[PDB]
Amino acid sequence: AKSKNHTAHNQTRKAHRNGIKKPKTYKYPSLKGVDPKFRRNHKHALHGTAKALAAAKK
Amino acid sequence: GRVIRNQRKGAGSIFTSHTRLRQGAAKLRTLDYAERHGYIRGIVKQIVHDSGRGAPLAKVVFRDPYKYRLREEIFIANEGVHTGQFIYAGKKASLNVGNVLPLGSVPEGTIVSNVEEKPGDRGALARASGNYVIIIGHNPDENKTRVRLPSGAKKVISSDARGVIGVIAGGGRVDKPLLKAGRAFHKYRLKRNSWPKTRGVAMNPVDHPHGGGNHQHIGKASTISRGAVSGQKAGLIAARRTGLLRGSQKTQ
Amino acid sequence: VNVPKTRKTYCKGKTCRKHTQHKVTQYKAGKASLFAQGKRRYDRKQSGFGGQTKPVFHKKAKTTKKVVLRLECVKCKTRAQLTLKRCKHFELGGEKKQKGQA
RNA sequence: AAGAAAAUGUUUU
RNA sequence: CGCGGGGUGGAGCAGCCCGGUAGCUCGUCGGGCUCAUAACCCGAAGGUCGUCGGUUCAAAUCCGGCCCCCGCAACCA
RNA sequence: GCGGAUUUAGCUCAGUUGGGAGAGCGCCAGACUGAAGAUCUGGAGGUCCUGUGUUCGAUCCACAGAAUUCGCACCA
RNA sequence: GAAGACAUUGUCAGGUGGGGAGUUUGGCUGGGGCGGCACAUCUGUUAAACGAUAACGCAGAUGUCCUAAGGGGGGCUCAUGGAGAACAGAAAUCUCCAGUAGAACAAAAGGGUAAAAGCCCCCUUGAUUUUGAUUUUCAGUGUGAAUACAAACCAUGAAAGUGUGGCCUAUCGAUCCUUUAGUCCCUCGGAAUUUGAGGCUAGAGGUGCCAGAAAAGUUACCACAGGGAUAACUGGCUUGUGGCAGUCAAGCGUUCAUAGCGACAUUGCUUUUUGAUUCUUCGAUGUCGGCUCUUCCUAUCAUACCGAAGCAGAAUUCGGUAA
RNA sequence: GUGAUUUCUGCCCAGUGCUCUGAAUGUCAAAGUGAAGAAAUUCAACCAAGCGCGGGUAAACGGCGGGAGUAACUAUGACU
RNA sequence: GCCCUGAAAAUGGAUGGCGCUCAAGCGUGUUACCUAUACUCUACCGUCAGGGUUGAUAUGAUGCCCUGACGAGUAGGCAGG
RNA sequence: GUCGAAUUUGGGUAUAGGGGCGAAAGACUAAUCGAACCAUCUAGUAGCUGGUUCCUGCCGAAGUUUCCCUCAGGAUAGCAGAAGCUCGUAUCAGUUUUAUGAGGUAAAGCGAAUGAUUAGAGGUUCCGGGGUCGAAAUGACCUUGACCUAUUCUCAAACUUUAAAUAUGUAAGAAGUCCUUGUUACUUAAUUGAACGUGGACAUUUGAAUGAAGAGCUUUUAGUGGGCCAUUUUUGGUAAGCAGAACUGGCGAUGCGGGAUGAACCGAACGUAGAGUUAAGGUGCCGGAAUACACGCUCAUCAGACACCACAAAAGGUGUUAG
RNA sequence: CACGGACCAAGGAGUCUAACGUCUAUGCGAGUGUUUGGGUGUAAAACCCAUACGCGUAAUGAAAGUGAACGUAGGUUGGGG
Numbered sequence A: 001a002k003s004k005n006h007t008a009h010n011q012t013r014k015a016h017r018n019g020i021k022k023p024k025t026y027k028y029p030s031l032k033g034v035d036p037k038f039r040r041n042h043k044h045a046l047h048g049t050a051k052a053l054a055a056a057k058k
Numbered sequence B: 001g002r003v004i005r006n007q008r009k010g011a012g013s014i015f016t017s018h019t020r021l022r023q024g025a026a027k028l029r030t031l032d033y034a035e036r037h038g039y040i041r042g043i044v045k046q047i048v049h050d051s052g053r054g055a056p057l058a059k060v061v062f063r064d065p066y067k068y069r070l071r072e073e074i075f076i077a078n079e080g081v082h083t084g085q086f087i088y089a090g091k092k093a094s095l096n097v098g099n100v101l102p103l104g105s106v107p108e109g110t111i112v113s114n115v116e117e118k119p120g121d122r123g124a125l126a127r128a129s130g131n132y133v134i135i136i137g138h139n140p141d142e143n144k145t146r147v148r149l150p151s152g153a154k155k156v157i158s159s160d161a162r163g164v165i166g167v168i169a170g171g172g173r174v175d176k177p178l179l180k181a182g183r184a185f186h187k188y189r190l191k192r193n194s195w196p197k198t199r200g201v202a203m204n205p206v207d208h209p210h211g212g213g214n215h216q217h218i219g220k221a222s223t224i225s226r227g228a229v230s231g232q233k234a235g236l237i238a239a240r241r242t243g244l245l246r247g248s249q250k251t252q
Numbered sequence C: 001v002n003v004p005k006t007r008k009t010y011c012k013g014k015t016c017r018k019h020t021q022h023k024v025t026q027y028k029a030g031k032a033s034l035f036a037q038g039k040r041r042y043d044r045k046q047s048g049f050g051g052q053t054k055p056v057f058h059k060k061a062k063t064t065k066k067v068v069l070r071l072e073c074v075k076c077k078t079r080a081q082l083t084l085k086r087c088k089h090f091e092l093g094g095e096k097k098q099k100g101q102a
Numbered sequence D: 001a002a003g004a005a006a007a008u009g010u011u012u013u
Numbered sequence E: 001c002g003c004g005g006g007g008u009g010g011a012g013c014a015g016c017c018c019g020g021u022a023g024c025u026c027g028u029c030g031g032g033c034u035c036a037u038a039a040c041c042c043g044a045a046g047g048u049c050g051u052c053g054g055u056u057c058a059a060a061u062c063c064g065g066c067c068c069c070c071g072c073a074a075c076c077a
Numbered sequence F: 001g002c003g004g005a006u007u008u009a010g011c012u013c014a015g016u017u018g019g020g021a022g023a024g025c026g027c028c029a030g031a032c033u034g035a036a037g038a039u040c041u042g043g044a045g046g047u048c049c050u051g052u053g054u055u056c057g058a059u060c061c062a063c064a065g066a067a068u069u070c071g072c073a074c075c076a
Numbered sequence G: 001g002a003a004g005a006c007a008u009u010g011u012c013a014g015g016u017g018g019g020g021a022g023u024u025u026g027g028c029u030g031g032g033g034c035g036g037c038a039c040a041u042c043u044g045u046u047a048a049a050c051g052a053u054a055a056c057g058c059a060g061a062u063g064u065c066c067u068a069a070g071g072g073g074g075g076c077u078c079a080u081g082g083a084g085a086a087c088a089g090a091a092a093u094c095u096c097c098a099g100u101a102g103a104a105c106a107a108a109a110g111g112g113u114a115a116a117a118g119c120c121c122c123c124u125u126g127a128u129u130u131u132g133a134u135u136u137u138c139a140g141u142g143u144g145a146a147u148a149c150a151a152a153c154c155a156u157g158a159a160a161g162u163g164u165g166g167c168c169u170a171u172c173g174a175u176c177c178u179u180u181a182g183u184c185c186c187u188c189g190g191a192a193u194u195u196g197a198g199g200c201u202a203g204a205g206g207u208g209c210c211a212g213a214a215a216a217g218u219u220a221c222c223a224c225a226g227g228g229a230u231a232a233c234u235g236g237c238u239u240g241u242g243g244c245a246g247u248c249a250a251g252c253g254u255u256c257a258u259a260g261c262g263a264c265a266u267u268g269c270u271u272u273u274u275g276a277u278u279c280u281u282c283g284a285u286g287u288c289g290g291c292u293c294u295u296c297c298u299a300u301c302a303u304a305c306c307g308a309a310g311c312a313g314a315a316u317u318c319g320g321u322a323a
Numbered sequence H: 001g002u003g004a005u006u007u008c009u010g011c012c013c014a015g016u017g018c019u020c021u022g023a024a025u026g027u028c029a030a031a032g033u034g035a036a037g038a039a040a041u042u043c044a045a046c047c048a049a050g051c052g053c054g055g056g057u058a059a060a061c062g063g064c065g066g067g068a069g070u071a072a073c074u075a076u077g078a079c080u
Numbered sequence I: 001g002c003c004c005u006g007a008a009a010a011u012g013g014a015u016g017g018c019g020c021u022c023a024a025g026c027g028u029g030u031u032a033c034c035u036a037u038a039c040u041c042u043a044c045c046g047u048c049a050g051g052g053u054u055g056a057u058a059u060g061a062u063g064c065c066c067u068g069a070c071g072a073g074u075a076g077g078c079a080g081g
Numbered sequence J: 001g002u003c004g005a006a007u008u009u010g011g012g013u014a015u016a017g018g019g020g021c022g023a024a025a026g027a028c029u030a031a032u033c034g035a036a037c038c039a040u041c042u043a044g045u046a047g048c049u050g051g052u053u054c055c056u057g058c059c060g061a062a063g064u065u066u067c068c069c070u071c072a073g074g075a076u077a078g079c080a081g082a083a084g085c086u087c088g089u090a091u092c093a094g095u096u097u098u099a100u101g102a103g104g105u106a107a108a109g110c111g112a113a114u115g116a117u118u119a120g121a122g123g124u125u126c127c128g129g130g131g132u133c134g135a136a137a138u139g140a141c142c143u144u145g146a147c148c149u150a151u152u153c154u155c156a157a158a159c160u161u162u163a164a165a166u167a168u169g170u171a172a173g174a175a176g177u178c179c180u181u182g183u184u185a186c187u188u189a190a191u192u193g194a195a196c197g198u199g200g201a202c203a204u205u206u207g208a209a210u211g212a213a214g215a216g217c218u219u220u221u222a223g224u225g226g227g228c229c230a231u232u233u234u235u236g237g238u239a240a241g242c243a244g245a246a247c248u249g250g251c252g253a254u255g256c257g258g259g260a261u262g263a264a265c266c267g268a269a270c271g272u273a274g275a276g277u278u279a280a281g282g283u284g285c286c287g288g289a290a291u292a293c294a295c296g297c298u299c300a301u302c303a304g305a306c307a308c309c310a311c312a313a314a315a316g317g318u319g320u321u322a323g
Numbered sequence K: 001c002a003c004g005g006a007c008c009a010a011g012g013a014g015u016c017u018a019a020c021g022u023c024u025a026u027g028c029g030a031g032u033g034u035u036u037g038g039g040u041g042u043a044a045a046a047c048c049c050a051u052a053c054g055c056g057u058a059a060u061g062a063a064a065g066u067g068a069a070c071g072u073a074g075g076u077u078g079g080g081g
């Protein structure tokens, strides 16, 4: 008793019923894959900027 | 998957011996003082047929040494014993056919029958028609007698074991062809339910080790180990050899 | 494959923590001990009636085993383990290849 | 007292 | 996983068991024997002993492996 | 029915690569013998199963038939 | 009387034990079985120029191999051809010229590569340590493989650099258990020491039915749940095969292609062959053949009437209307 | 097991069984013994039957092929 | 091009039937006409949506009212009855 | 068939369910036998078959992905409902345009590489040598085969320089363009840069078109996980109402008008009605609607008569028509 | 030309429970749960209640163990009101 093996029939219709959703872009994307040396220095630079701007409030 | 016939025989329901017509157990006298020291004379009253036994029996009447009465014994008649013959049983009895003597009191080469395996068992050896035991020697110290049994086996028995001088009557019985299923039927009707015999290869696998197959055949060796279990011991149990026996007996 | 001994490679022995000379041997499993908790449990389970109580693997397919090199640092004796790819013939001794031989 | 092995040889003069 | 039996002229085997060392038969060839043939007798050729190291005075022989074949015991991924 | 194979000096076989046609045994001679038989040497021997087929030609390149057989099927 | 601390009997231990017990005895599949592996995979193609894409599609390949065939550097240039040089010829070694790779790069195939990725030489262990991210398969799980970094320690080179195995695309493995390495760290719970045991981190011993049960048959004595999801009839589609019929006309027929035939080709019809398929039927369409009986078809054997002839007659052959 | 009578039951013990030796022993349980250890324990020797080895056995289960050469037409091989 | 030969199958039978021949056939062109649960307009039912209206005699703000659109349905979900 | 002995038979008695009994059939053991009957465990389990009870309203599928001892089952994602939630000066889109990429199929090509492939010509007679002479060479011819040169005919899913159409990635702004200068342990020879900041300028078209019963977000669950058909692309097969893929549209799940009839074709999708107009299809009669109009063609002793579709070919005909 | 159905009546199939996910309503709220039990009663009801206990208020680690404010409980972008 053999059966059907594969088909993509109706798959695009199913996909488009709830649509192909664009991936909801955000400002400030994540830094997941960024070089860790750059991230370490970025953390130190941002901390320094925060301290400077905290003292800058006069 | 089923209990085979040789297994079913042990329960003894329909395989018991048909003993109704039998004259009673054929036994020597109880070994008493008279036989241990002298002899006692009995008289052969009847020589009768025993159902299921080839050999005739002799009813021998002795006096009771301790009470005024007669005691009838059922010996297995030795050939040549006749009614009205005086039988002498004991250590001092003469070497005449029909007398019951201790094995140690007879010379080498004596032919005896209904020989006790142990003193006082009243007869165990050489009881079938035409059979006998031969005295082949004595060992007086540690008193024993070496004897040859009908099978050809050599046995060492106590010298106080008794036997009847002569050979069991009715010999030659198996020399006549039965010639007929009916004659085998009447033979076994008075012995036991062991006839006729269905071949195991003619049965189904459930009934027998040999059963089954699209041809009748054993399938595996019919020689079966001595250590096999019940339901397996069909065929040739613990066979040292098989095939048409070519050669000599009495292995040294 | 032919793997040499003496293996200059990294050592984590907290004293070397650097590339040192290592002696290379082939790892052998070592005897299965009684009193290992799994063995104790298995013996207890096997005791009595019930027969075999755990699987006995039969459907063997591999024709090789992965060779494990035991790397013992010659200075601090710290041992590391390096697994190689499957090979049918593994040798640690010498007799290196020669180029241009007939 | 006794002393292993030894096969073969075409037809017609 | 473990332990054994082995592997030696073209073929089949001895030699190992504490190393002076490689032989036997069959097969091939040649010779001899016989008046001649067969049988028989002898000689030659044919292997360096599966392989790699070592112990050794020197190893087929011992000691560790490696290859191949056969067998046996044991069995939780 | 269909799928395979073999068709070769007189007999049994090897071929061949788009070439030839050889081996034994048989037969005919020569050595040998008094003459022979064996044993030794030699020699001759096919129009490659048939028709067409491409070629400069062709058993062999390479096709359809005939035979000799091997095997598989022919009612549920 | 015999026998005697032996038998026996009790417990444990090894053997034997289809006599008996319990169980199992893959999947895919143009039915099932046998075969094969399309079951875990890789190259090219099918594949319809993003990606994805099936069949027991096509041509193949994988369970390995390598201390170098890994890493770095340097020098060099390959197949083949031509022209030359004793033995040396068509093929050995030497020389020059041409040489875009027509070679080689472990293996299948595809891609890639020329002061190299190839060949030769020199030095080496980046085939190392730590734990993350990422790509493919994908559920955006695992596994395998791979990418780019970080933090170390190294190799090579003058150096820039390159190297985290093999130029790239395949070459592989959970839980539980065992075992090893590491941490000398945690726990053994009344309190200690020392063994032992148990944990924590990384491997290994393996599941190829490859997301990973521990597993032999037979049943024509058979059983149950089902299945027309699926075979063994008819029927239906098809018509390779079978059968029947055309067209052309090289030749046969003494001469003459077609009286009668007819090669090489080629167009069809039929469903009285056998296949192919699996649509109907497995809560059942009674499975060979014969007998009996009716009817239908015509691709006509005979009978009727005709045409043709290699039809003198006779016999016959080809053909037409005709069931 | 075979299956009246008659006649006859050939060859084969390698295999699977069945059945008996040799154990200057190979495998080898529990108990027991020795060593090491603080012990748990580990290691070792010893080690029954059985297996293994050797023998027997087919009116036990069963089996009873192939190739080569060789007779003076050929063929086939009594023969090797 | 059309027609014809090629053109043989089994119950009696199918351009759907009758029948049709300057067609009621074939090719082509032009109009008129017929009629779907489709389209347009209108009403009514319901659903959904957007609104108005707690200012009184106002007890039904889950009410009353205005406006627009929409309505297929197995397995299945939910709602109001 | 047998009928005087292995004979028939009454009664008593024995053997009881993995048991008996069996002159052996798996026979018989109370119509029960390849394991009796009775009760209980037990409402045993079933991925399998059957059934599953009121109405209306709204929404409304899937037969696909991955994994499974999986292939009649499930988990998983997808499709669906419900509940909503945050907002709505609003966002996006099965679409186009513009700009910019990617591709290696259709086609094309082979006097372009690889591999096939026809022929002749000009040179290597060194050609592979032979035939033939040549006394004998290759010495002169011929030759067939190759090689070289320029041509020539024909081809490729696993060939290719070139190379579409369709399909496909990205962008078309305020999260933008530019300007000044603060942080850092990163980076640079170096305030060199990198990233992130502080400050400042730039709203009618805030930077193509069209649309937008809005956009975004979340939870949770049903069913489904046999599909099939049509056009086109396409694989295996002679083919199939066969078997397997691609895209879309459908049927399943769907009535309605048409194709007589029919799941899928054409048209069109459906609350209850009225009127109008149409679609596809038709208008001799059945049958609503012109035996309408117009130009031709056809006569069939098997005429023909609307796609899917219910078949007909090669070859022929002073039939007839037009070229 | 698949299965069940000759007919009619009556019966006839997603239930209850333990423990749970989402959602919703309600009470109280860093707390919450009176009903094991006690008190009481017009007596299985209703009414009242101490101490505990459960869940929550703390996580993380195999464990020994350690255990949540640099700051207006942070900066930036958006964000209804």
Ligand SMILES: [K+]
Residues within 6 Å of the ligand: B201, B209, B210, B211, B212, B213, B215, B216, B217, B218, B219
């Ligand atoms: K049998």
Ligand SMILES: [K+]
Residues within 6 Å of the ligand: C045, C046, C047, C048, C049, C050, C051, C053
């Ligand atoms: K147990």
Ligand SMILES: [K+]
Residues within 6 Å of the ligand: D012
């Ligand atoms: K003569």
Ligand SMILES: [K+]
Residues within 6 Å of the ligand: G017, G018, G019
């Ligand atoms: K057994």
Ligand SMILES: [K+]
Residues within 6 Å of the ligand: none
């Ligand atoms: K079974």
Ligand SMILES: [K+]
Residues within 6 Å of the ligand: G239
């Ligand atoms: K046909």
Ligand SMILES: [K+]
Residues within 6 Å of the ligand: G281, G282
């Ligand atoms: K059926």
Ligand SMILES: [K+]
Residues within 6 Å of the ligand: H013
């Ligand atoms: K034998």
Ligand SMILES: [K+]
Residues within 6 Å of the ligand: H013
């Ligand atoms: K034997």
Ligand SMILES: [Mg+2]
Residues within 6 Å of the ligand: A003, A004
């Ligand atoms: Mg399916």
Ligand SMILES: [Mg+2]
Residues within 6 Å of the ligand: B016, B017, B019
């Ligand atoms: Mg009795």
Ligand SMILES: [Mg+2]
Residues within 6 Å of the ligand: B197
């Ligand atoms: Mg008998």
Ligand SMILES: [Mg+2]
Residues within 6 Å of the ligand: B197, B198, B199
């Ligand atoms: Mg019998």
Ligand SMILES: [Mg+2]
Residues within 6 Å of the ligand: B202, B203, B204
């Ligand atoms: Mg039988």
Ligand SMILES: [Mg+2]
Residues within 6 Å of the ligand: B001, B205, B206, B208, B209
């Ligand atoms: Mg049996």
Ligand SMILES: [Mg+2]
Residues within 6 Å of the ligand: B209, B220
């Ligand atoms: Mg047996």
